[PDB]
Paper text:
The 3CLpro is a cysteine protease that plays an essential role in the replication of coronaviruses by digesting viral polyprotein at more than 11 sites. Domains I and II (residues 1 to 184) have an antiparallel β-barrel structure that forms chymotrypsin folds, and the substrate binding site is located in the gap between these two domains. Additionally, domain III (residues 201 to 303) is a compact α-helical domain connected to domain II by a long hinge loop (LH-loop, residues from Gln189 to Asp197). The protease is known to be activated by dimerization of two monomers, each containing a catalyst dyad defined by Cys145 and His41 residues (active site).
The crystal structure of the catalytic domain of SARS-CoV-2 CLpro was determined at 2.27 Å resolution. There were four protomers in the asymmetric unit. Interestingly, they existed as a dimer with dimensions of ~83 × 48 × 36 Å despite the absence of the dimerization domain (domain III) known to be crucial in dimerization. In the crystal structure of the catalytic domain, dimeric interfaces were made by backbone hydrogen pairs of Ala7 N and O atoms with O (3.39 Å) and N (2.88 Å) atoms of Val125’ (the other subunit), respectively. A hydrophobic pocket composed of Pro9, Val13, Leu115’, and Val125’ also participated in the formation of a dimer. The first six residues (Ser1 and Met6) and the last eight residues (Gln189 to Thr196) in the LH-loop were not visible in the final model though they were predicted to form a short β-strand in PSIPRED. The five residues not well defined were due to the absence of domain III influencing a local conformation around Ser139. The crystal structure indicates that the decreased proteolytic activity of the catalytic domain was due to the incomplete construction of the substrate binding part built by the LH-loop. Enzyme kinetic studies with a FRET method revealed that the catalytic domain alone presents enzymatic activity, despite it being approximately 8.6 times less than that in the full domain.
Residue numbers in the entry: 7 to 188
The structure:
């Protein structure tokens, strides 16, 4: 597994309504699964576009440690929510977003409400799922490779599937495989 120190300093907690999950804090932007803006009665046929319009900035509670990061904008890029905040993360590492394939390994920093609890070497199965240990709250954990001193973020966990396997996106919000957040 890759050492996790660069990524630990980016992990945050995002809460919307009933829902709380992990966010990734880079520069003045927090990335997290967009389904954070759903109460899961919305989870049957969500209109994310109508949902995101209905939210205002104070609807989003972002905390890194016991600092609040004030959200000053919210946009959506495919399936990831992008919260603009009023401060840039002074611990932002050199980073890039990359898309990978099943079979290629990466490390995942499992967190429970912005709090890191393990780092694990994973790969997606050919059907783009991943079998590990991440329940409610570990939603939003990200995966990465470290190449020299640059963190290539390649994965964000979004959902546990009925089979127990997990589905996720890349950091541009595009799901790996045919999965949907519905």
């Amino acid at each position: 597994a890759f050492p996790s120190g660069k990524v630990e300093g980016c992990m945050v907690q995002v809460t919307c309504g009933t829902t709380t999950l992990n966010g990734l804090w880079l520069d003045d932007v927090v990335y997290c699964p967009r389904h954070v803006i759903c109460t899961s009665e919305d989870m049957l046929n969500p209109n994310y576009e109508d949902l995101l319009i209905r939210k205002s900035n104070h609807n989003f509670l972002v905390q890194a440690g016991n600092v609040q990061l004030r959200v000053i904008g919210h946009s959506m890029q495919n399936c990831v929510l992008k919260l603009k905040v009023d401060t840039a993360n002074p611990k932002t590492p050199k980073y890039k977003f990359v898309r990978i394939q099943p079979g290629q390994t990466f490390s995942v920093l499992a967190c429970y409400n912005g709090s890191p609890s393990g780092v694990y070497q994973c790969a997606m199965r050919p059907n783009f799922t991943i079998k590990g240990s991440f329940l409610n709250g570990s939603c939003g954990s990200v995966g990465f490779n470290i190449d020299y001193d640059c963190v290539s973020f390649c994965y964000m966990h979004h959902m546990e599937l009925p089979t127990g396997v997990h589905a996720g996106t890349d950091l541009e919000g595009n799901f790996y495989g045919p999965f949907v957040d519905r």
